[PDB]
Amino acid sequence: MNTVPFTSAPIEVTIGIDQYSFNVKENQPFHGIKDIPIGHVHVIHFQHADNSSMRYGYWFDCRMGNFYIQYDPKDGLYKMMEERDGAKFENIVHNFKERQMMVSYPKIDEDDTWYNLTEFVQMDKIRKIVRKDENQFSYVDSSMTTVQENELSDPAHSLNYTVINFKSREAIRPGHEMEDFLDKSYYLNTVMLQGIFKNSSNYFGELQFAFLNAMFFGNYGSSLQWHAMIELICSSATVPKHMLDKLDEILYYQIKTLPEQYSDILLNERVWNICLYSSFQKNSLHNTEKIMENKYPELL
Amino acid sequence: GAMNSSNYAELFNNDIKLFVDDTNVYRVTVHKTFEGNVATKAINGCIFTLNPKTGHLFLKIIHTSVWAGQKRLSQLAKWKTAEEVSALVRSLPKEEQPKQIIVTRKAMLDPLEVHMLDFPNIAIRPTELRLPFSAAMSIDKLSDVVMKATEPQMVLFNIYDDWLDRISSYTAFSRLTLLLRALKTNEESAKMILLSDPTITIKSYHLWPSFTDEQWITIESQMRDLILTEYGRKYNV
Numbered sequence: 001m002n003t004v005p006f007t008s009a010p011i012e013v014t015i016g017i018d019q020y021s022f023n024v025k026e027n028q029p030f031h032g033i034k035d036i037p038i039g040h041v042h043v044i045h046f047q048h049a050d051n052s053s054m055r056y057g058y059w060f061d062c063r064m065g066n067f068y069i070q071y072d073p074k075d076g077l078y079k080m081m082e083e084r085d086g087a088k089f090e091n092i093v094h095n096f097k098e099r100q101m102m103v104s105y106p107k108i109d110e111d112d113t114w115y116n117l118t119e120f121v122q123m124d125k126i127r128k129i130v131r132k133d134e135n136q137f138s139y140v141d142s143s144m145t146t147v148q149e150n151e152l153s154d155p156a157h158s159l160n161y162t163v164i165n166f167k168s169r170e171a172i173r174p175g176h177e178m179e180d181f182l183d184k185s186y187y188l189n190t191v192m193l194q195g196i197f198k199n200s201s202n203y204f205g206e207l208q209f210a211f212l213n214a215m216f217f218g219n220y221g222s223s224l225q226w227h228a229m230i231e232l233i234c235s236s237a238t239v240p241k242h243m244l245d246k247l248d249e250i251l252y253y254q255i256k257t258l259p260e261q262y263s264d265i266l267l268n269e270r271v272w273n274i275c276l277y278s279s280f281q282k283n284s285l286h287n288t289e290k291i292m293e294n295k296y297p298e299l300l
Numbered sequence: 301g302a303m304n305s306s307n308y309a310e311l312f313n314n315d316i317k318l319f320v321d322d323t324n325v326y327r328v329t330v331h332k333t334f335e336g337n338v339a340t341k342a343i344n345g346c347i348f349t350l351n352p353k354t355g356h357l358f359l360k361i362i363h364t365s366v367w368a369g370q371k372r373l374s375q376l377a378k379w380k381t382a383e384e385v386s387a388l389v390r391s392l393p394k395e396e397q398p399k400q401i402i403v404t405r406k407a408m409l410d411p412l413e414v415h416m417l418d419f420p421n422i423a424i425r426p427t428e429l430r431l432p433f434s435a436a437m438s439i440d441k442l443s444d445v446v447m448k449a450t451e452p453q454m455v456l457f458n459i460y461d462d463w464l465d466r467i468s469s470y471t472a473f474s475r476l477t478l479l480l481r482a483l484k485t486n487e488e489s490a491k492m493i494l495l496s497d498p499t500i501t502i503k504s505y506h507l508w509p510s511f512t513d514e515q516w517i518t519i520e521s522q523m524r525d526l527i528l529t530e531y532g533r534k535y536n537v
């Protein structure tokens with residue numbers, strides 16, 4: 001188990017750690033989060049009580065370094081930093097734990113939710129989408145735009161998701177226009193899987209990361225990317241059977257975790273109705289179709 | 301964006317543009333089979349591609365052999381249309397290529413956009429005008445070349461005959477749409493109007509009769525009366 005200490009909490013803030021969240025009062029004696037499971041990426045996220053504008057946060061993996069949070073009164077946010085002095089860090093954490101000034105990552109033993117949402121997500125791939133090579137962790141916020149959004153504006157602060165565009169020369173082979181537009185298997189299997197992502201695990205990792213940024217930060221371009229990566233699979237007539245079964249599991253857990261009250265803004269009616277009821281894969285997503293029909297029958 | 305009555309003079313400016321109508325590409329007759337089921341038989345069709353400023357009509361004849369062994373023909377027809385329009389554009393010198401292609405039916409937008417990805421600067425647009433171009437096959441010389449075709453063929457016409465020597469392209473387009481709307485509403489009576497006077501003939505190199513300016517005014521009035529007459533017959537007015 002690993003720990004992310006906080007120097008202090010000078011401003012009132014709702015703090016998220018993965019799918020959990022808790023409120024910290026202004027100047028409350030809060031000094032961090034302990035018992036964080038090793039083996040997964042994690043996200044620690046923030047929404048200030050006095051300005052809900054800008055949710056923001058940090059993706060990290062405690063196996064890559066010792067990380068802590070410290071508020072910056074000049075830039076007005078909680079910042080993640082790395083401590084290179086290991087003995088200093090261990091000493092800090094021990095004192096805060098002895099004084100019981102930390103919240104415990106509250107994982108139920110039965111509960112595989114976070115694994116199921118991050119199965120294919122790897123820090124190395126996160127750091128290629130979010131480019132800031134001097135840190136081992138990655139900052140994301142509500143307002144950051146994607147490379148594709150910028151094409152249609154600061155590049156250093158962008159989300160470099162893989163561009164998917166169904167009406168593009170990349171997606172459509174000269175001479176196979178109707179075939180490739182109505183059956184996206186070429187674009188999925190040759191262009192994206194063999195060419196760009198190399199394997200389905202990397203494709204699912206990006207899909208899962210896009211979902212999580214959409215849900216935790218309300219990041220609109222991430223929501224667009226998540227739906228585009230679903231639609232590309234559902235609109236392909238030829239998809240490996242193992243990918244369809246895994247997609248069904250991925251989507252099931254994403255739909256299960258989504259706050260019911262955010263469904264109106266996080267789910268695209270056209271994409272979901274097309275994917276579940278018109279597409280080539282309309283009968284291949286049994287678990288996802290069942291939870292969607294029982295939880296969000298309005299959207300359909 | 302889309303083209304409507306607000307930006308109507310845009311059709312007659314100096315930016316090359318084409319209308320594309322696909323309503324006569326896939327044509328069938330429906331009939332009973334010996335067993336009493338229903339079957340279709342395709343007949344030759346055409347793509348109607350028109351420059352509204354110059355009157356130049358690129359009539360691509362769609363021979364029934366292109367449907368042989370194909371499924372979902374009404375969907376295929378839209379993609380075949382887009383394929384043929386793209387091929388036409390590529391066949392024209394750069395300085396003759398359109399800057400805009402206006403499709404008469406919104407279902408042609410995606411097929412044409414996809415076929416024209418190599419031409420990112422050519423705008424593909426719908427229209428809110430209800431244009432009567434389906435009635436092209438009521439023009440005898442166009443119907444004849446389509447029905448006699450034994451293979452795919454492109455035939456070029458000027459749909460305005462020599463009218464642009466005497467009238468503007470705005471007026472010529474208005475005359476054409478009135479004639480075609482009348483042929484669509486009551487073909488028999490419209491052709492009666494156009495040919496009732498044997499002393500006015502159609503030149504070998506023309507599609508419509510050689511009416512004088514005053515005769516065109518009379519013809520146009522009779523076509524408007526025909527449209528109004530049929531409107532009253534339809535709605536009991």
Ligand SMILES: CS(=O)(=O)Nc1ccccc1CN
Binds near residue numbers: 031101104
């Ligand atoms: C940050 S904190 O200090 O509120 N954490 C904490 C944890 C366990 C028990 C009690 C407390 C503080 N009452």
